[PDB]
Amino acid sequence: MKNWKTSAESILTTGPVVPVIVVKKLEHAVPMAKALVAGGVRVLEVTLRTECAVDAIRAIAKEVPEAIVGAGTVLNPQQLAEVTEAGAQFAISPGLTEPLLKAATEGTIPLIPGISTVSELMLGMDYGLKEFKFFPAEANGGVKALQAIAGPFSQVRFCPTGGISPANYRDYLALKSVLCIGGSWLVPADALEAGDYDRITKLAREAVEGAKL
Amino acid sequence: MKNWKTSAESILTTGPVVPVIVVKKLEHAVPMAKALVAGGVRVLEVTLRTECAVDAIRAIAKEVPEAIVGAGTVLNPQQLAEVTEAGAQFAISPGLTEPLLKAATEGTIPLIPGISTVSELMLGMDYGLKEFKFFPAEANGGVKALQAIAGPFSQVRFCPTGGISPANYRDYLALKSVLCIGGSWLVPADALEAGDYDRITKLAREAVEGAKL
Amino acid sequence: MKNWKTSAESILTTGPVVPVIVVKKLEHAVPMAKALVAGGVRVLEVTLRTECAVDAIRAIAKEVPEAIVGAGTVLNPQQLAEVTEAGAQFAISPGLTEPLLKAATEGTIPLIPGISTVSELMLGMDYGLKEFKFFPAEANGGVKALQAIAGPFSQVRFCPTGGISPANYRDYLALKSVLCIGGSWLVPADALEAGDYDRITKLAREAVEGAKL
């Protein structure tokens, strides 16, 4: 993608786990980010699901240069522009649309959009995309659905998200078409409150080590 | 929606159950409508699946003005225009398309379209819709699928239809994102054959009572 | 379809099984095709998943006149034009897109595109299509998903492909909405590589026989 200095591919190959973060209290954002990085996890997807999401991205971009912070739940060009202005290095959407694909490919940061069907995948491919999220992974029919969906497209790569846990992420990572998975367990909503970051570091370290072979 | 004097939201918040109606003999339409209204069920989806469907909508709008009569299985702008002219107060589609979303938003009655994936949901959201049918519910993976799909979208509301019955409607109604469900069991064929409209009134009454809490 | 001398329907009604072919070695294409025809299987889908695919289609169209050869994995107008020029009698795609639907209906050969949802089906129906692939059949939820999806569309017909084998093709063929199925087992990759043509003829004959009643 000519307008993207950082490729979507590089974002996904950084590590085997991309945490799907929901941040309710802004003050927890930076420490949380540092804790994840200290555990070996650098690509951070801050979902636009709370009022302070954009401000958390901005704060993490400024105070934690060691993170590759991005946005999640980007639903339209308007939000895409807002997270870009805030410093997102990448954007994730749970699905795709023509206006979002047009705005993203014309913009400066990579978009890795979710798909659930081959038709949706083909529409992203019409805009030159090769990297996608497979969301909701389990609900779309998990590993087997993903193996079927990917069968006719040898060059495509995914980051399945949705119902993935330490119990099954290895099943996904074993696939040739999968580069990494998205998960919510590295940052327990209740771990935030009270200032419990060592817990988060530990979980991240275990996620990374549990991913090998 | 600026062109819609009756909102899509008000159609779905009217009651917990929207009967999905397949009218084979025109003469049954009006008495069936009155019987459903007597039992407290007023939002009536007359599917464009039988030859007399548009005539039933027109007869119900004329003889049972208190019912909120609408059309179902609306597949394109041409059908939407026909049911609108016939007196439909709302239109339901099993899936969505851009010309259908465009024609609907340019028109006078609300469209509540079905979606099965987040991408389809996002395309509806680009036209500013917030109310959707989740069809076919069970085959799309039922409750869990809907819970995964709805997780990143806090403002959207659904009316799941497809495989819902007394056995499981409460499961769907309990979700925060669900306002009502679509079902076919309120109008049994044998009650019509018997002219036992009281059976239909009773079933509607039970559907509504069984939905509380 | 006015620009299609051969209807999409005639393609699907020719036989109960359409082999999904992956030809790695160009030299094996013609005798493979003759072996399938000798076993009673004429509609051949040569997928655009190998470098020699378009040449295989050309060689089969010229040399095995009793075969109805077409292309598979057609992803955009460019590929459609190319297989059209090489002699394909039909095109199959794993999903659909407006550009693909528009180029196909303006063209000379039938496109039977795959769908997974009612919205995808409706988009195809906006361009006048009545015949579709249901891909990936099993991952989409198999027979039940297909039954639910087709319930509101009495005129639509399908060719399910994806996870279908002798163990279950009968379950699909028994549906009133199914005209035939697509499968990969008649042409085992290892038989094509070695030139086991009597084996291929035998598998084809068993496929056809096992499909009755």
Short mmCIF file of all heavy atoms in Angstrom, two decimals, chain B residues 121-162:
data_model
loop_
_atom_site.label_atom_id
_atom_site.label_comp_id
_atom_site.label_asym_id
_atom_site.label_seq_id
_atom_site.Cartn_x
_atom_site.Cartn_y
_atom_site.Cartn_z
N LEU B 121 -23.97 -5.12 8.89
CA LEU B 121 -24.44 -4.21 9.93
C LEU B 121 -23.82 -2.83 9.70
O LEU B 121 -24.46 -1.81 9.84
CB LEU B 121 -24.02 -4.73 11.30
CG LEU B 121 -24.42 -3.80 12.46
CD1 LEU B 121 -25.99 -3.82 12.64
CD2 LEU B 121 -23.73 -4.30 13.77
N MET B 122 -22.54 -2.81 9.38
CA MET B 122 -21.85 -1.55 9.11
C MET B 122 -22.36 -0.82 7.88
O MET B 122 -22.34 0.40 7.87
CB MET B 122 -20.34 -1.80 8.98
CG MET B 122 -19.70 -1.93 10.37
SD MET B 122 -18.04 -2.59 10.39
CE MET B 122 -17.12 -1.26 9.50
N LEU B 123 -22.80 -1.56 6.86
CA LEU B 123 -23.30 -0.93 5.65
C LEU B 123 -24.64 -0.27 6.03
O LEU B 123 -24.95 0.85 5.58
CB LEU B 123 -23.45 -1.98 4.51
CG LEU B 123 -24.33 -1.57 3.32
CD1 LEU B 123 -23.90 -0.20 2.77
CD2 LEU B 123 -24.23 -2.65 2.22
N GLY B 124 -25.42 -0.91 6.90
CA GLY B 124 -26.69 -0.30 7.29
C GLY B 124 -26.42 0.95 8.13
O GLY B 124 -27.09 1.98 8.01
N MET B 125 -25.41 0.86 8.98
CA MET B 125 -25.05 1.98 9.81
C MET B 125 -24.51 3.14 8.95
O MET B 125 -24.63 4.31 9.36
CB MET B 125 -24.03 1.55 10.88
CG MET B 125 -24.60 0.60 11.92
SD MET B 125 -23.41 0.22 13.23
CE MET B 125 -22.51 -1.14 12.48
N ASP B 126 -23.94 2.88 7.77
CA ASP B 126 -23.49 4.02 6.97
C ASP B 126 -24.72 4.87 6.54
O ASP B 126 -24.60 6.08 6.37
CB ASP B 126 -22.72 3.54 5.72
CG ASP B 126 -21.28 3.12 6.04
OD1 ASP B 126 -20.83 3.30 7.20
OD2 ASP B 126 -20.60 2.59 5.11
N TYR B 127 -25.90 4.26 6.40
CA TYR B 127 -27.11 5.00 5.99
C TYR B 127 -27.86 5.50 7.20
O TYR B 127 -29.00 5.98 7.13
CB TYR B 127 -28.02 4.16 5.09
CG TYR B 127 -27.45 4.01 3.68
CD1 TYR B 127 -26.32 3.23 3.46
CD2 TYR B 127 -28.00 4.70 2.60
CE1 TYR B 127 -25.74 3.13 2.19
CE2 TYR B 127 -27.42 4.61 1.31
CZ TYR B 127 -26.29 3.83 1.12
OH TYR B 127 -25.66 3.76 -0.12
N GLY B 128 -27.17 5.42 8.34
CA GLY B 128 -27.74 5.89 9.57
C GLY B 128 -28.75 5.00 10.30
O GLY B 128 -29.40 5.49 11.22
N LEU B 129 -28.92 3.75 9.88
CA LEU B 129 -29.84 2.84 10.60
C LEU B 129 -29.20 2.35 11.88
O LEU B 129 -27.99 2.11 11.92
CB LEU B 129 -30.18 1.60 9.79
CG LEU B 129 -31.01 1.84 8.54
CD1 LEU B 129 -31.61 0.50 8.04
CD2 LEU B 129 -32.13 2.74 8.94
N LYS B 130 -30.04 2.18 12.90
CA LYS B 130 -29.63 1.67 14.22
C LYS B 130 -30.47 0.46 14.64
O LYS B 130 -30.14 -0.18 15.60
CB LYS B 130 -29.80 2.75 15.32
CG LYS B 130 -28.76 3.86 15.29
CD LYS B 130 -28.99 4.83 16.43
CE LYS B 130 -27.87 5.86 16.52
NZ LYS B 130 -28.12 6.84 17.62
N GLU B 131 -31.57 0.21 13.94
CA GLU B 131 -32.44 -0.94 14.21
C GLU B 131 -32.37 -2.00 13.11
O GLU B 131 -32.59 -1.71 11.94
CB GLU B 131 -33.89 -0.49 14.37
CG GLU B 131 -34.24 0.11 15.74
CD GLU B 131 -33.81 1.58 15.87
OE1 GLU B 131 -34.01 2.39 14.90
OE2 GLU B 131 -33.26 1.91 16.94
N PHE B 132 -32.12 -3.25 13.50
CA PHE B 132 -31.98 -4.33 12.54
C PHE B 132 -32.64 -5.63 12.95
O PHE B 132 -32.89 -5.86 14.13
CB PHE B 132 -30.51 -4.65 12.32
CG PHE B 132 -29.71 -3.49 11.87
CD1 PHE B 132 -29.20 -2.57 12.80
CD2 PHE B 132 -29.49 -3.27 10.51
CE1 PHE B 132 -28.47 -1.45 12.35
CE2 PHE B 132 -28.78 -2.17 10.08
CZ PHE B 132 -28.27 -1.26 10.99
N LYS B 133 -32.89 -6.47 11.95
CA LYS B 133 -33.44 -7.80 12.21
C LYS B 133 -32.18 -8.63 12.27
O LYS B 133 -31.20 -8.26 11.64
CB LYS B 133 -34.28 -8.33 11.04
CG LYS B 133 -35.67 -7.68 10.88
CD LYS B 133 -36.46 -7.79 12.18
CE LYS B 133 -37.96 -7.84 11.94
NZ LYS B 133 -38.35 -9.24 11.57
N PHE B 134 -32.17 -9.71 13.04
CA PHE B 134 -31.01 -10.59 13.04
C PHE B 134 -31.65 -11.83 12.41
O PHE B 134 -32.38 -12.56 13.08
CB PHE B 134 -30.51 -10.89 14.46
CG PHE B 134 -29.29 -11.78 14.51
CD1 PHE B 134 -28.07 -11.37 13.98
CD2 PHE B 134 -29.37 -13.03 15.10
CE1 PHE B 134 -26.93 -12.20 14.02
CE2 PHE B 134 -28.23 -13.87 15.15
CZ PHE B 134 -27.02 -13.45 14.61
N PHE B 135 -31.41 -12.04 11.11
CA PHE B 135 -32.02 -13.15 10.37
C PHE B 135 -31.06 -13.91 9.46
O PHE B 135 -30.22 -13.28 8.82
CB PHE B 135 -33.13 -12.58 9.47
CG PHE B 135 -33.81 -13.63 8.62
CD1 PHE B 135 -34.83 -14.43 9.16
CD2 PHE B 135 -33.37 -13.89 7.33
CE1 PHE B 135 -35.38 -15.49 8.41
CE2 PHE B 135 -33.93 -14.96 6.58
CZ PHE B 135 -34.93 -15.75 7.12
N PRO B 136 -31.13 -15.26 9.43
CA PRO B 136 -31.99 -16.15 10.22
C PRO B 136 -31.24 -16.37 11.54
O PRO B 136 -30.11 -16.85 11.52
CB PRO B 136 -32.10 -17.43 9.36
CG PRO B 136 -31.13 -17.25 8.17
CD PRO B 136 -30.26 -16.03 8.52
N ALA B 137 -31.85 -16.00 12.66
CA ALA B 137 -31.22 -16.09 13.98
C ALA B 137 -30.52 -17.39 14.36
O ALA B 137 -29.30 -17.41 14.55
CB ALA B 137 -32.23 -15.72 15.06
N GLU B 138 -31.27 -18.48 14.46
CA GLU B 138 -30.68 -19.73 14.88
C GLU B 138 -29.54 -20.14 13.95
O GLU B 138 -28.43 -20.40 14.40
CB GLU B 138 -31.75 -20.82 15.00
CG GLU B 138 -32.65 -20.66 16.22
CD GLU B 138 -31.93 -20.84 17.57
OE1 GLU B 138 -31.73 -22.00 17.99
OE2 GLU B 138 -31.55 -19.83 18.22
N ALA B 139 -29.80 -20.18 12.65
CA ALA B 139 -28.74 -20.56 11.70
C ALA B 139 -27.52 -19.64 11.74
O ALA B 139 -26.42 -20.08 11.41
CB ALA B 139 -29.30 -20.60 10.30
N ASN B 140 -27.70 -18.37 12.09
CA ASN B 140 -26.55 -17.47 12.18
C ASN B 140 -25.75 -17.85 13.46
O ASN B 140 -24.68 -17.29 13.73
CB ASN B 140 -27.02 -16.01 12.29
CG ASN B 140 -27.50 -15.41 10.94
OD1 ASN B 140 -27.38 -16.03 9.88
ND2 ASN B 140 -28.02 -14.19 10.99
N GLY B 141 -26.25 -18.80 14.24
CA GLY B 141 -25.57 -19.16 15.47
C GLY B 141 -26.28 -18.70 16.75
O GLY B 141 -25.68 -18.65 17.83
N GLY B 142 -27.56 -18.33 16.63
CA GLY B 142 -28.34 -17.93 17.80
C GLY B 142 -27.78 -16.88 18.74
O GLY B 142 -27.01 -16.01 18.34
N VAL B 143 -28.19 -16.98 20.00
CA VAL B 143 -27.82 -16.04 21.04
C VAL B 143 -26.33 -15.69 21.13
O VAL B 143 -25.96 -14.51 21.15
CB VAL B 143 -28.35 -16.59 22.39
CG1 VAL B 143 -27.92 -15.73 23.55
CG2 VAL B 143 -29.90 -16.70 22.31
N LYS B 144 -25.49 -16.70 21.21
CA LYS B 144 -24.04 -16.48 21.29
C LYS B 144 -23.56 -15.65 20.09
O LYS B 144 -22.84 -14.66 20.23
CB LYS B 144 -23.33 -17.84 21.32
CG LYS B 144 -23.35 -18.54 22.69
CD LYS B 144 -24.72 -18.51 23.35
CE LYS B 144 -24.64 -19.01 24.79
NZ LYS B 144 -25.93 -18.86 25.51
N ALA B 145 -23.96 -16.05 18.90
CA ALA B 145 -23.52 -15.30 17.71
C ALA B 145 -23.94 -13.86 17.83
O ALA B 145 -23.12 -12.95 17.66
CB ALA B 145 -24.09 -15.93 16.45
N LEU B 146 -25.20 -13.63 18.19
CA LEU B 146 -25.69 -12.27 18.35
C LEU B 146 -24.88 -11.55 19.45
O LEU B 146 -24.54 -10.37 19.29
CB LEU B 146 -27.20 -12.30 18.66
CG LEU B 146 -28.00 -10.98 18.62
CD1 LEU B 146 -27.79 -10.25 17.28
CD2 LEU B 146 -29.47 -11.31 18.86
N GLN B 147 -24.56 -12.23 20.55
CA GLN B 147 -23.77 -11.58 21.59
C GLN B 147 -22.36 -11.20 21.10
O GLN B 147 -21.80 -10.20 21.54
CB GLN B 147 -23.61 -12.48 22.80
CG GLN B 147 -24.83 -12.60 23.65
CD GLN B 147 -24.70 -13.66 24.72
OE1 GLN B 147 -24.25 -14.81 24.45
NE2 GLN B 147 -25.11 -13.31 25.94
N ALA B 148 -21.77 -12.01 20.23
CA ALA B 148 -20.43 -11.70 19.74
C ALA B 148 -20.49 -10.53 18.76
O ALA B 148 -19.68 -9.60 18.83
CB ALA B 148 -19.81 -12.93 19.06
N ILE B 149 -21.45 -10.63 17.84
CA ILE B 149 -21.67 -9.61 16.82
C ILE B 149 -21.97 -8.27 17.42
O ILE B 149 -21.43 -7.27 16.97
CB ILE B 149 -22.84 -9.99 15.91
CG1 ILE B 149 -22.37 -10.98 14.86
CG2 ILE B 149 -23.41 -8.76 15.22
CD1 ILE B 149 -23.52 -11.64 14.09
N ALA B 150 -22.79 -8.24 18.46
CA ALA B 150 -23.19 -6.99 19.09
C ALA B 150 -22.20 -6.37 20.06
O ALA B 150 -22.30 -5.19 20.38
CB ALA B 150 -24.56 -7.17 19.77
N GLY B 151 -21.25 -7.17 20.55
CA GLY B 151 -20.26 -6.66 21.50
C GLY B 151 -19.59 -5.31 21.20
O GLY B 151 -19.49 -4.48 22.10
N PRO B 152 -19.09 -5.06 19.98
CA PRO B 152 -18.44 -3.77 19.65
C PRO B 152 -19.44 -2.65 19.32
O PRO B 152 -19.05 -1.49 19.16
CB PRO B 152 -17.60 -4.11 18.42
CG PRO B 152 -17.47 -5.62 18.45
CD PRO B 152 -18.81 -6.07 18.96
N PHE B 153 -20.72 -2.99 19.19
CA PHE B 153 -21.73 -2.00 18.83
C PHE B 153 -22.75 -1.77 19.92
O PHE B 153 -23.83 -2.38 19.91
CB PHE B 153 -22.47 -2.43 17.58
CG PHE B 153 -21.57 -2.77 16.45
CD1 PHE B 153 -21.07 -4.06 16.32
CD2 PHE B 153 -21.20 -1.80 15.53
CE1 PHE B 153 -20.22 -4.38 15.30
CE2 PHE B 153 -20.33 -2.11 14.48
CZ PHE B 153 -19.84 -3.38 14.36
N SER B 154 -22.46 -0.85 20.83
CA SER B 154 -23.37 -0.60 21.94
C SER B 154 -24.70 0.11 21.60
O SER B 154 -25.66 -0.03 22.35
CB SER B 154 -22.66 0.21 23.02
OG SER B 154 -22.52 1.55 22.61
N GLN B 155 -24.77 0.87 20.52
CA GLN B 155 -26.00 1.58 20.21
C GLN B 155 -27.01 0.84 19.32
O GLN B 155 -28.15 1.30 19.16
CB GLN B 155 -25.69 2.91 19.55
CG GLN B 155 -25.20 4.02 20.46
CD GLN B 155 -25.00 5.33 19.68
OE1 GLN B 155 -25.95 5.86 19.07
NE2 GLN B 155 -23.75 5.84 19.67
N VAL B 156 -26.64 -0.29 18.75
CA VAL B 156 -27.55 -0.99 17.86
C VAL B 156 -28.58 -1.91 18.56
O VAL B 156 -28.29 -2.52 19.60
CB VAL B 156 -26.71 -1.76 16.82
CG1 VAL B 156 -27.47 -2.90 16.24
CG2 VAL B 156 -26.29 -0.80 15.68
N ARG B 157 -29.78 -2.00 18.00
CA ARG B 157 -30.82 -2.86 18.57
C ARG B 157 -31.35 -3.83 17.51
O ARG B 157 -31.41 -3.51 16.34
CB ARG B 157 -31.97 -2.01 19.12
CG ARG B 157 -31.58 -1.22 20.34
CD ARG B 157 -31.07 -2.15 21.45
NE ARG B 157 -30.66 -1.40 22.63
CZ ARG B 157 -29.43 -0.93 22.86
NH1 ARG B 157 -28.44 -1.11 22.00
NH2 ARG B 157 -29.20 -0.28 23.99
N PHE B 158 -31.74 -5.02 17.97
CA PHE B 158 -32.17 -6.10 17.11
C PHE B 158 -33.51 -6.75 17.38
O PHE B 158 -34.03 -6.76 18.52
CB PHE B 158 -31.14 -7.29 17.14
CG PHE B 158 -29.73 -6.92 16.66
CD1 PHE B 158 -28.73 -6.59 17.57
CD2 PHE B 158 -29.43 -6.88 15.31
CE1 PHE B 158 -27.43 -6.22 17.12
CE2 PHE B 158 -28.13 -6.52 14.85
CZ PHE B 158 -27.13 -6.18 15.75
N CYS B 159 -34.04 -7.33 16.30
CA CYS B 159 -35.25 -8.12 16.35
C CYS B 159 -34.85 -9.44 15.68
O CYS B 159 -34.90 -9.57 14.46
CB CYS B 159 -36.39 -7.47 15.59
SG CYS B 159 -37.92 -8.50 15.60
N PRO B 160 -34.38 -10.42 16.46
CA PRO B 160 -33.98 -11.72 15.93
C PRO B 160 -35.19 -12.49 15.38
O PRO B 160 -36.25 -12.48 15.98
CB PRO B 160 -33.35 -12.43 17.14
CG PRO B 160 -32.77 -11.25 17.95
CD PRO B 160 -33.91 -10.24 17.85
N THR B 161 -35.05 -13.10 14.21
CA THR B 161 -36.13 -13.85 13.61
C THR B 161 -35.49 -15.05 12.95
O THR B 161 -34.38 -14.93 12.40
CB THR B 161 -36.85 -13.03 12.54
OG1 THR B 161 -37.36 -11.82 13.10
CG2 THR B 161 -37.98 -13.78 11.99
N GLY B 162 -36.15 -16.21 13.01
CA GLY B 162 -35.63 -17.43 12.38
C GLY B 162 -35.31 -18.52 13.39
O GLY B 162 -34.27 -18.50 14.02
#
